[PDB]
Design a protein around this ligand. Structure first.
Ligand code: HEA
Ligand code: HEA
Ligand code: CUA
Ligand SMILES: [Cu+2]
Ligand SMILES: [Zn+2]
Lengths: 268, 56, 374, 117, 535, 124, 58, 48, 100, 236
């Protein structure tokens, strides 16, 4: 603190965010989504062009937050060593919360599997409910996810050795390699012979493999925003907190899939 | 002598824990020998008189 | 009542194997600051196995004459004495004597108690459920024990973890006071297939047996780990067990039990090898998870295999599988810690783990023989 | 937005911390692209200068009014927390020395003064 | 445009705490009137105010539980005292994620609209506070009412989770120059421990309530027993959140009491490290016991025996805190200011309320007390007389440091006595009604239960008067508050010691152990420019 | 003499510039050896420093506890008057009469009920 | 100029005098539609929540 | 303008309408909303 | 852990090095805050410290803290029959002789 | 048994289970009164001795023996309480020979009782439904909101095993005097047992919430002698 002109710069390494309008807008978008969804399922709206508008507004609100979180790290220059560590801790504390919604779903599958009721004849996947062969497309998906886990590690080891063509290719292959997972798991819901309402089995199967779907569309969006933010020279060889955040989300999703394949497709 | 006083609060603590427990045991030994046991006795003497009528 | 007897035996086994693991976070460190050896600590953790294995033959003779209840109460008395000795013991002889007494106490609360449950429930169907429920907290003991010992050792002194167990044992003993010829094991350890089945469990659990004494010392030296952390590193394995035995218990019926055991051996071997390459406590989360999961698979696959092999190749009794598993576990726990000092003083800690991992991996291919047994 | 710095001797503000640019076809480094209070840290750790100190206060000597402990502040006040001369003996008492009056620590008695920088 | 950039588009943590306070008062007035409406219908046998509607009594009870568990205690105890105080105590300028603070505020007003619209779009949502599956279906409740109350437990959940992440990430890396995680004040520890439970418990409730919504609207058969489901599953997925919840409401109170006892008894807290471990143990053992709410559902006899034992162990850590507060009050000087009276009324009434918990943790005795007003009297002594008292003490303690304006002591004392008498007259006879056998959630009762219902409806009118007097106390604080610092020596944060002269006291007046009471009368918008130092 | 004599009845009405002159005149009068101080000076020095003014006043005076007591009573007499108004206007069903609760007693007596402590439905 | 405008937008966002979300000459295309549609979405969920309290259906 | 009436969202002094009106209306609305819902649902179900 | 004979040496040393009135009152406030009543020698140093700093009220209030610290009245009169040459030499008058 | 106007304590018991509940409650209340009296006395001492005190003991802040005494003493009380709780939990139940079975199906706002014995060759099984007598149709002296048109009638000194299920929502079978409180979920069968020691009438009420008229679902159990039970069963 005895540097010559030290009062001209901030005396602590923490970010004083300027006033922004996004928290209010997201709240008003969620209000409209909640009320419109709670009404449209019971009459009172009729037209489904309001629910779609509400969802679009929510997504646009998150996108417009993230713009201002990118102009403050690449252009203004406010992410010191401390702010980056805080961001990492925060992201881990959200991944942990997203893992504990899957534990509830797994405990809803072991509370029905072990102890099947009298109404259904005591047997898993019960009579008249033909399961999905787990030596078909649901192995191709597992091989794809394991490959995607290895293609992003070639993207993070090429941004440290300073290869640009070799960090763009890895991200491109990874993004083309999670779209095939979505395509395979959308060709496996249109080739199935049991719906949401035919049992307690088809209602938990499509609630742990349907939330994973929503979580894998987000990977495609994150990886696109990480390819486009590398094409435009936004990432340095030692300051890239979007790749690290996207890689710790891919790996959690792969580990969760390895527990929806040996507990949902194989076990029974 | 009278000009060497060393520990006074410790004795107070010992006397105030040895009287908050005597009161507690006194106010808890009335719940078990003046409110509970006579009730059980009354209950039992009711049943050793409802059976003698049936025997007769 | 039958339910109260089940409660008594369940709590007895839980307290017996809970006191076998609260020692682990504590004694390796307690006998490491008094000096300011490897074989010494390795044998401190191995008196229990030898004593139990040598007392199993004679506790049966004891239970033939006097009966069931008195031997059960003897396990009470011995285990209470052992917990009091562990409460106040800074000399290696006293702790060694405590572990030696623990073996007799444990063997008296298992041979007699399981027989008591068998005697009470004579249905041949309810026996399976009762014996399974009673033996389930046997594994919970080493899930609730390691963290508790480390936490109360860091936060409080040594005697705090060791007097709670004494109080709980005394409650169990008060409840006990209130409540009150098949094919021999020798021949069943003669036919080769059950020999392979028992060896599977022995070599599977030798890894954890060797990790128990040795791991805290290496962690303290190369890691600068705190007193509590020694417990936490062992949390992922135990929890992992409770996962692996729920999924791969039914899955092995359709994947082939032999294949399940063979894969579990490879997984545990790789997990054991990966342990030496850890620099932070987060690095122990993965290999411990793997070792617990693989041991769970190996147990859940091999043990019913022993039941089927025994009831096909020979004529069987109810405690036959239990006796086989007792001899296997005790032999493994005797051998592991005992060879730990010898194979860790001359050569470093990584080498002993590597040897055990290679042994498990090379024993894996023998599981093919159990497929389609004669 | 103006002349670029090369060390922390030439940084008179945030106008001296924009920097050169990377070249087309390479992963840019942190000396070629970093602006604000992030480049100040880089420019300090490449010389040894820690721009953000994390040293707790002096607990070696007590403080009298003739010879008081000098706390450096870029304001007229600074919050000082005293725990004693052996440095954890006294419990924690918080204090606000100013340019007009000195803190005195009602238990141990250490006096604190401001060096206004 | 300066107004909008400070009270709608905000980044400052202390400007959001005030909005939490103003929202909490509104949502605690609504719930109090809804409690008065219940307590005027349960006065004498018959149908008195709600003319014959047994719906609109369950709707009132549900909206009284939701409005004042989720909208009064949490916002006040986590936002008004967490957001405003934690950054100042740990020495941080603002929080690590400011926009998340703003969103945590702004998700609440749109959560009140859904709940209030769940009471006007049809007969209502009379499912009870715990929205059990087979009644909250589409055969008894057919309308957009249960859905619009479920969407009020999602927005609040998001707000709480986002606040918890901010709290944990601000106390880890935004401390001062010499403050390690062993010198933190006890309130910071309270917020950290409640924030860990919020992360670990909220997702289970989200899963359960979303599955209920899917069953109602998309025909999923999660909890229908004609497709292979069990309603009991919901209970598990609720009560895993249920018991951590009841500790989230009480741990922030504990810390507040510590500070009060440390000031008006001029003594440090007996065993601060012990208190930290005690709060940690209470938090940890609040996750492993959740099935004592459901002993009558048909559990095994080996699961009742575990849950009886795992509930009585929580008494050990709380006894440490109670005895430590007595020990810290013992040797020192006590001055009976308005915060200290509430501190005394929390050390006795919370004990009375929690000792009834050890009578209800037994599986054998819960056959006689479950679905009975004994439970109601239990949790009112720990909620209404334990948490609301802590909130009032915190207000009367930190209001002058926030606003710069003082309050009349006599009116505050009158309010305290009226709350004490009214709350003790309203909830105590519920124990007798429970022992004699009066069930819960009944509008009309047999003639035998009349008498106590007439004594328990007289206390509600004594507590509403206390609320009105609280409003007038705020009015005298805001208007002519500057001239209310000379009426009494309650204004002083600490009196002179025995040998300390008045002249020396006036120069050196504030002697503290936290950065709270050294700040300006209203704290500066940017409080810490040059960092604070600790030894 | 007059300046210091009887400062218990005059001290607080003086401004803060006539208060720092009395202290600055007792601090050059105390440097002399004591036994040269008049009794009025001795008493004033004690009062100025250790006395019942300023930071040393009570939280509750005798005229404040009466105010609090008579404020609580006037708050319990309002609730009583509001509760009586909601009490005269009640819906009293047919069952809440003594001639009906003496009929239920005959039933509960015939079917022996509450053999212990008591049966009695009479509360008028 | 070249693909590194990074050293030219870092001299623009600093020294701007406008809020950072409305400084670039492209924020119009993001902010006009968003605020326009938000006011219709919020005015359609307040017309159907008062029209529902009265019992009117579609 | 830091001071004692600066951190409150509402103005309290030097005001056209005296502050008692805004202070009273807040509490009146808060304590009257729970009665409006009861009136609506009582008049929607035949009851007076 | 500290004995009477170490208490009564440490506080004599503290009292013989106070230089202002704030320090005299600080050391007097932390002396009457233990379980040990100060010895007649320590109070003999307190009065000399109060005489060096030139304060009269503090020398009267020391004797008024003894009667609250001691347990009975005979002990108080045993303190005043031995601290009588110090009082009549310095000139200190107890409160009950001033009646302020 | 019927509630009494100003009650303070339990209703009168007619089964061994309720006597065990009362005894265990009175055993726990002993220690609870001890602890409350201790805490109250120390607060009284604090107010009486240390209110506006001149001496502040600001150095008593650690404790070591006292800290082990409030961590071990409360534990001993918990063990002492836990012993009888476990004995009662595992001991008292239908160990031998249940003697009669009554299925109590809880519909929306009434009860349905079936007697699983007394079956003819054609399925003549005895069954009835219990409703609440409204206030307008009450006779002279009948109890309001507890009196039913058809009442369960059982012999004295006979084990009665109730099997509880539900048809619509979650109800609760509760008769306080007999110590029976079991839940009735829509897809499972729950069971309780009772032995009644004296003749009389025992009233009870539903517990779990079920909707609008959850206040009108009384249960009424009569314990007649064996001869009167035989005469009753031969008219239905
Ligand atoms: C918010 C306040 C609060 C708190 C802090 C707690 C915590 C505790 N609760 Fe919880 N509880 C509720 C409010 C609260 N609860 C509510 C609202 C419900 C459910 C209502 C519903 O869902 O309808 C519930 C649920 C609930 C039930 C279920 C009731 C039922 O439906 O049958 C029970 C008992 O079974 C219980 C008991 C306890 C106990 C023993 C504690 C313990 O933490 C309290 C321990 C306190 C003491 C022990 C004082 C210690 C003092 C000492 C001097 C130590 C002495 C030592 C011994 C006595 C050994 N609570
Ligand atoms: C938050 C805990 C809480 C609170 C505050 C209250 C408040 C009150 N409650 Fe309780 N009550 C519950 C817990 C609580 N209740 C719960 C969980 C239920 C639902 C049970 C169910 O679902 O069945 C319930 C329901 C309930 C019922 C209906 C139960 C039923 O029949 O099923 C009844 C009376 O019958 C009752 C009693 C009372 C009374 C008379 C008050 C009143 O005395 C209010 C007391 C007055 C106050 C507490 C003043 C509040 C203070 C302010 C508003 C200012 C706030 C201060 C700051 C912000 C600084 N409550
Ligand atoms: Cu039926 Cu309630
Ligand atoms: Cu609970
Ligand atoms: Zn100090």
């Amino acid at each position: 603190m005895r540097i010559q002109n030290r009062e001209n710069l901030q005396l602590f390494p923490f970010h004083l965010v300027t006033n922004s309008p996004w928290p209010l807008t997201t709240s008003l978008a969620l209000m409209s989504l909640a009320l419109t969804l709670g009404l449209t399922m019971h009459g009172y709206i009729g037209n489904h062009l309001w629910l779609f508008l509400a969802i679009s507004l929510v997504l646009s609100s998150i996108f417009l937050w993230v713009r201002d979180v990118v102009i403050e790290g690449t252009y203004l220059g406010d992410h010191t060593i401390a702010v980056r560590k805080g961001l990492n801790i925060g992201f881990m504390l959200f991944v942990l919360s997203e893992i504990l919604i899957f534990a509830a779903l797994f405990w809803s599958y072991f509370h029905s599997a072990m102890g099947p009721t009298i109404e259904i004849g005591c047997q898993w996947p019960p009579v008249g409910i033909t399961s999905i062969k787990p030596t078909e497309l649901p192995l191709l998906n597992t091989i794809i996810l394991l490959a995607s886990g290895a293609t992003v590690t070639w993207a993070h080891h090429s941004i440290l050795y300073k290869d640009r063509q070799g960090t763009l290719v890895g991200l491109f292959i990874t993004t083309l390699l999670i779209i095939l997972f979505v395509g395979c798991q959308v060709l496996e819901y249109t080739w199935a012979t049991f719906t949401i309402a035919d049992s307690v089995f088809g209602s938990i199967f499509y609630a742990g493999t349907g939330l994973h779907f929503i979580h894998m569309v987000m990977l495609i969006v994150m990886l696109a925003i990480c390819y486009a933010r590398m094409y435009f020279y936004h990432f340095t060889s030692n300051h890239h907190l979007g790749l690290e955040t996207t890689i710790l989300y891919l790996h959690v999703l792969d580990i969760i899939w390895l527990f929806l394949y040996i507990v949902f497709y194989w076990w029974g | 002598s009278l000009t060497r006083i060393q520990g006074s609060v410790k004795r107070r603590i010992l006397t105030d824990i040895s009287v908050g427990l005597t009161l507690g045991f006194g106010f808890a030994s009335y719940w078990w020998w003046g409110v509970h046991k006579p009730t059980v006795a009354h209950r039992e003497n009711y049943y050793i008189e409802l059976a003698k009528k049936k025997k007769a | 009542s039958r339910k109260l007897i089940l409660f008594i035996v369940f709590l007895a086994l839980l307290l017996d194997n809970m006191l076998l693991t609260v020692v682990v976070p504590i004694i390796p460190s307690y006998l490491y600051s008094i000096k300011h050896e490897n074989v010494q600590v390795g044998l401190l953790f191995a008196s229990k196995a030898t004593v139990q294995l040598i007392t199993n033959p004679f506790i049966g003779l004891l239970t033939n004459r006097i009966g069931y209840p008195i031997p059960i109460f003897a396990g009470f008395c011995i285990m209470f004495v052992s917990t009091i000795m562990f409460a106040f013991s800074s000399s290696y002889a006293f702790l060694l004597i405590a572990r030696s007494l623990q073996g007799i106490g444990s063997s008296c609360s298992s041979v007699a108690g399981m027989g008591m449950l068998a005697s009470v429930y004579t249905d041949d169907e309810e026996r399976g459920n009762v014996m399974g429920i009673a033996l389930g907290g046997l594994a919970m003991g080493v899930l609730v024990g390691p963290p508790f010992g480390s936490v109360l050792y860091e936060f409080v002194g040594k005697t705090a973890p060791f007097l709670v167990l004494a109080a709980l044992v005394l409650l169990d003993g008060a409840i006990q006071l209130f409540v009150l010829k098949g094919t021999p094991l020798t021949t069943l350890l003669k036919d080769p297939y059950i020999l392979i089945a028992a060896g599977s469990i022995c070599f599977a659990n030798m890894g954890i047996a060797m990790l128990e004494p040795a791991l805290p010392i290496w962690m303290m030296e190369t890691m600068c780990s705190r007193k509590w952390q020694l417990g936490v590193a062992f949390l992922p394995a135990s929890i992992s067990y409770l996962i692996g035995t729920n999924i791969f218990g039914i899955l092995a019926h359709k994947m082939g039990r032999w294949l399940c055991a063979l894969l579990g051996m490879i997984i545990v071997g790789v997990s054991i090898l990966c342990i030496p390459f850890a620099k932070n406590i987060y690095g122990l989360i993965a290999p411990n998870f793997g070792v617990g999961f693989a041991i769970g698979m190996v147990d859940s696959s091999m043990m019913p295999i022993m039941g089927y092999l025994v009831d096909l190749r020979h004529v069987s009794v109810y405690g036959s599988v239990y006796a086989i598993a007792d001899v296997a576990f005790c032999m493994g726990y005797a051998i592991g810690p005992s060879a730990g000092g010898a194979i860790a003083k001359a050569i470093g800690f990584p080498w002993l783990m590597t040897i055990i991992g290679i042994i498990d991996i090379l024993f894996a291919p023998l599981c093919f023989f159990l497929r389609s047994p004669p | 937005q103006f002349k670029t710095a090369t060390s922390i001797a030439e940084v008179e503000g945030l106008e001296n911390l924009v920097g050169p640019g990377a070249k087309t076809g390479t992963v840019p480094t942190d000396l070629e692209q970093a602006t604000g209070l992030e480049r100040y840290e880089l420019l300090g750790k490449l010389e040894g200068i820690e721009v953000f100190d994390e040293t707790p206060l002096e607990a070696v000597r007590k403080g009298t009014m003739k010879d008081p402990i000098l706390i450096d502040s870029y304001d007229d006040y600074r919050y000082v927390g005293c725990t004693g001369v052996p440095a954890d003996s006294h419990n924690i008492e918080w204090l606000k020395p100013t340019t007009e009056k000195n803190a005195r620590c009602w238990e141990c008695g250490s006096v604190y003064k401001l060096n206004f920088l | 445009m300066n107004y909008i950039n400070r009270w709608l588009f905000s980044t400052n943590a202390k400007d959001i705490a005030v909005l939490y306070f103003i929202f909490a008062l509104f949502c605690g007035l609504l719930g109090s009137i809804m409690s008065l409406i219940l307590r005027l219908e349960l006065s004498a046998p018959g149908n008195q105010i709600l003319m014959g509607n047994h719906q609109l009594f369950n709707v009132v009870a549900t909206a009284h539980a939701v409005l004042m568990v989720f909208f009064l205690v949490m916002p006040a105890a986590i936002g008004f005292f967490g957001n405003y105080l934690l950054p100042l105590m740990i020495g941080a300028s603002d929080m690590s994620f400011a926009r998340l603070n703003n969103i945590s505020f702004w998700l609440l007003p749109p959560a009140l609209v859904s709940l209030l619209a769940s009471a006007l779009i049809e007969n209502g949502a009379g499912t009870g506070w715990t929205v059990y599956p087979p009644l909250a279906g589409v055969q008894s409740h057919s309308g957009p009412s249960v859905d619009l109350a479920i969407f009020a437990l999602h927005l609040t959940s998001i707000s709480s989770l986002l606040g918890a992440i901010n709290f944990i990430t601000t106390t880890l890396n935004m401390r001062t120059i010499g403050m390690t995680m062993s010198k933190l004040p006890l309130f910071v520890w309270a917020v950290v421990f409640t924030s860990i439970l919020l992360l670990l418990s909220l997702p289970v409730l989200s899963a359960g309530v979303t599955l209920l919504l899917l069953d109602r609207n998309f025909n999923t058969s999660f909890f229908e027993p004609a497709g292979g489901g069990d309603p009991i599953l919901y209970q598990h997925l609720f009560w895993f959140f249920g018991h951590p919840e009841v500790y989230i409401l009480i741990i922030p109170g504990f810390g507040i009491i510590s500070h009060i006892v440390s000031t008006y008894s001029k003594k440090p807290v007996f065993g601060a490290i012990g208190m930290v471990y005690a709060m940690g143990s209470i938090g940890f053992l609040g996750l492993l016991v959740w099935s004592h709410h459901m002993y009558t559902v048909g559990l095994d006899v080996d699961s009742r025996a575990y849950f009886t034992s795992a509930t009585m162990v929580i008494a050990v850590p709380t006894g440490i805190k109670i005895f430590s507060w007595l020990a810290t009050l013992y040797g020192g000087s006590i001055r009976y200011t308005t915060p200290m009276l509430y501190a005394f009324a929390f050390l006795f009434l919370f004990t009375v309320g929690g000792l009834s918990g050890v009578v209800l943790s037994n599986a054998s005795l819960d056959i006689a007390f479950h679905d009975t007003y004994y439970v109601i009297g239990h949790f009112h002594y720990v909620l209404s007389l334990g948490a609301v008292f802590s909130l009032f003490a915190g207000y009367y303690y930190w209001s002058p440091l926030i606003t710069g304006l003082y309050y009349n002591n006599n009116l505050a004392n009158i309010q305290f006595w009226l709350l004490f008498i009214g709350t003790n007259v309203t909830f105590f006879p519920m124990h007798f009604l429970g022992l004699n056998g009066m069930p819960r959630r009944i509008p009309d009762y047999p003639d035998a239960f009349a008498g106590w219902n007439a004594i328990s409806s007289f206390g509600s009118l004594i507590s509403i008067i206390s609320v009105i007097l609280f409003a007038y106390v705020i009015y005298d604080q805001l208007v002519n508050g500057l001239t209310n610092k000379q009426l009494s020596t309650n204004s002083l944060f600490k009196n002179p010691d025995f040998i300390e002269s008045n002249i020396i006291f006036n120069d050196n007046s504030i002697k503290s152990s936290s950065i709270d009471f050294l700040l300006t009368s209203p704290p500066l918008p940017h409080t810490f420019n040059t960092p604070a130092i600790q030894s | 003499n007059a300046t210091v004599t009887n400062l218990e009845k005059r001290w607080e009405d003086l401004p803060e510039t006539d208060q720092k002159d009395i202290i600055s005149q007792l601090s050059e009068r105390q440097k002399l050896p004591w036994k040269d101080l008049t009794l009025s000076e001795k008493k004033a020095a004690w009062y100025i420093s250790f006395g019942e003014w300023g930071p040393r006043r009570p939280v509750h005076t005798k005229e404040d506890k009466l105010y609090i007591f008579w404020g609580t009573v006037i708050g319990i007499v309002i609730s009583a008057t509001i509760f009586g108004a909601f009490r005269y206007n009640r819906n009293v069903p047919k069952t809440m009469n003594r001639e009906w609760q003496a009929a239920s007693d005959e039933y509960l007596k015939s079917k022996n009920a509450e053999p212990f402590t008591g049966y009695s439905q009479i509360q008028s | 100029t070249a693909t590194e405008k990074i050293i030219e937008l870092q001299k623009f966002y600093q020294s701007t005098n406008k809020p950072i979300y409305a400084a670039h000459p492209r924020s119009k295309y993001y902010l006009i539609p968003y605020f326009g549609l938000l006011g219709v979405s919020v005015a359609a969920t307040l017309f159907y929540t008062g029209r529902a309290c009265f019992g009117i259906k579609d | 303008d830091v001071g004692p009436y600066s951190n409150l969202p509402f103005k309290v002094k030097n005001r056209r309408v005296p502050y008692a009106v805004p202070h009273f209306l807040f509490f009146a609305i808060g304590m009257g909303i729970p009665f409006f819902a009861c009136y609506v649902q009582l008049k929607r179900s035949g009851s007076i | 852990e500290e004995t009477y004979e170490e208490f009564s040496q440490r506080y004599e040393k503290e009292f013989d090095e106070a230089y202002d009135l704030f320090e005299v009152q600080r050391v007097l406030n932390n002396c009457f805050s233990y379980d040990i009543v100060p010895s007649p020698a320590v109070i003999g140093k307190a009065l000399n410290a109060c005489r060096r700093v030139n304060d009269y009220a503090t020398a009267v209030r020391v004797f008024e803290g003894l009667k609250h610290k001691v347990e009975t009245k005979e002990q108080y009169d045993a303190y005043l029959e031995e601290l009588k040459d110090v009082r009549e030499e310095l000139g200190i008058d107890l409160k009950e002789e001033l009646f302020p | 048994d019927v509630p009494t106007p100003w009650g303070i304590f339990f209703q009168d018991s007619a089964t061994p289970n309720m006597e065990g509940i009362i005894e265990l409650h009175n055993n726990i209340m002993f220690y609870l009164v001890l602890i409350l009296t201790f805490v109250s006395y120390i607060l009284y001492t604090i107010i009486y001795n240390y209110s506006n005190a001149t001496i502040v003991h600001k150095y008593m802040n650690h404790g070591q023996l006292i800290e082990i005494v409030w961590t071990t003493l409360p534990a001993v009380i918990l063990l002492i309480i836990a012993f009888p709780s476990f004995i009662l939990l595992y001991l008292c139940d239908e160990v031998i020979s249940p003697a009669m079975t009554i299925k109590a199906i809880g519909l929306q706002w009434y009860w349905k009782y079936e007697y699983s014995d007394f079956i003819n060759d054609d399925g003549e099984i005895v069954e009835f439904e219990s409703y609440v007598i409204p206030e307008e149709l009450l006779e002279d002296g009948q109890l309001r909101l507890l009196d039913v048109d058809a009442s369960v009638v059982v012999p004295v000194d006979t084990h009665i095993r109730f099997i509880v299920s539900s048809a619509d929502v979650i109800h609760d079978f509760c008769v306080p005097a007999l110590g029976v409180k079991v839940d009735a979920s829509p897809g499972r069968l729950n069971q309780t047992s009772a032995l009644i020691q004296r003749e009389g009438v025992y009233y009870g009420q539903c517990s779990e919430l079920c909707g609008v008229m959850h206040s009108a679902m009384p249960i009424k159990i009569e314990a007649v002698s064996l001869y009167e039970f035989i005469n009753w069963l031969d008219e239905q």
